[PDB]
Design a protein around this nucleic acid. Sequence first.
DNA 1: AAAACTATGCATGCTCTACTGCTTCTGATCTAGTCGACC
Length: 152
Amino acid sequence: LLDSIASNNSAKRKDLIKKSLLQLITQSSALEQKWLIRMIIKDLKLGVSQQTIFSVFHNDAAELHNVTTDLEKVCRQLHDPSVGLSDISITLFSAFKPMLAAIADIEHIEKDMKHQSFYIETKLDGERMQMHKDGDVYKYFSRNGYNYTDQF
DNA sequence: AAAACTATGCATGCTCTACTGCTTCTGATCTAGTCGACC
């Protein structure tokens, strides 16, 4: 039902969205409808961190989610708790969580660089993107893993 | 010369086809607000 509603919103159709929501309402209880509303809004407020959920799911799941950024692969590969992954590293056509930068104090900057020469670069204002190229197959991914390939 | 039959013009009713006014449906435009994702 959620897939139908999302695709149908993407297709510029509202009568079908109304039908799907009506079916969900008619075939749900008050608590189920409340939870469904929370998932639609994309907030649950469970009080438990996503990192905790991933850790309980498998020993090495946060790293795999960072490298891949797709709940399907993490859920599929990490099924048997005993069986782990030998080596996890960036792979083609799979979004990876970008590496960010933290505030720095000009006074102790040299100390933060272990008293060694460093690189100074200009700050760029705009979107953060990553490009995957294999032959003439191109994929573009945004900061959080959304696919912007259609635009570019 | 008188009576009977028939012709034609007009009255009456009915039915059918333009034209004007009122009400309601549809389309096009504008204005206001909502949702996505990022920073």
